[PDB]
Ligand binder design. Sequence first.
Ligand SMILES: [Cl-]
Lengths: 101, 272
Amino acid sequence: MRKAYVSVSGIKAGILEELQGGTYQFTYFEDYHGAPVSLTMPLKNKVYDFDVFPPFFEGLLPEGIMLEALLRKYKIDKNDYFGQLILVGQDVVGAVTIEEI
Amino acid sequence: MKHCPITYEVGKMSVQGVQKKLSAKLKIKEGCFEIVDQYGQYILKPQSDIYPELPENEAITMTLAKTIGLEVPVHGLVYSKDNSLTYFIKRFDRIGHNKKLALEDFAQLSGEDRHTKYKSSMEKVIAVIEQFCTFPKIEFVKLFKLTLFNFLVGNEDMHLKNFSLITKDRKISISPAYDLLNSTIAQKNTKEELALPLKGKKNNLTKSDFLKYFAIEKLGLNQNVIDGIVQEFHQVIPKWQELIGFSFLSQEMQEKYLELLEQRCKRLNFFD
Ligand SMILES: [Cl-]
């Protein structure tokens, strides 16, 4: 399905993968040794599974009128959170960036 | 939107979601703002068409926070193209040379999302701080001071996404202030005093809630520390009154602001 590179301050950190059945999974690249993507996901584990869209990545999406602005710019359905993340992933709050594979 | 500074450098309930938040760059030569789609260093907040005078409200409120000693980034007002006022704030997750700092809001840190950013509590906020902050005891003092400020100035919109932890020079702490304003006077039929319950309460909060349950039993602050901070707020009320009367709020909006501030000061026995 759909996968994306997740970078921290320009250095490639891991891969966020859309899995079947609505699950998601984030996997750290073994080469990565920088700051964690988030404080809830330190480098001591490499694989994180999620039964929904992981809160951290959902927290990067716009809100309110800004979400309405995104939704009338792009041909993307509301509640396609992963698709919206790829669209804005070049520049979000913090040091994390998202780019599609 | 896109000009240069002035005198200044669904059954849910949210309020900030009726106002735009625009990215912008500071023009190096011209010293004016340029809205950009991406890669901005400032945030611009123009007038909302639903709630009135939000930029002027946010600008004075962030200045009041700076006067009591909260960490407040550079902010101010600019005239939009339609000759109205637009608020700006310098992002603290961008630090020149096009570097970034890690910044995470408490909804991300506690597993909540946008739809559930009100389904939490200040006890849960404290727990996030105790988990991740480098010096939780120092951050607890800041939280206490932030929560008292938001009560006094009628900010009833401090949901989970309005708290953030910043990672700066390997130190994790509560970020500088952002999105602070008097949302009570901006609305009509205001429903709550606190966005997240404290001791299970979102309205009719009392002195013992903040100064006993919160300050002592949940934050572990010594009595002499509490007394000093309370004294700080006492000494700043005259300065706050002056600043509000000198702000860019309309006279009617200034009066709503002062009357709310006095009502909240009186409930905490500031004038007794
Ligand atoms: Cl400490």
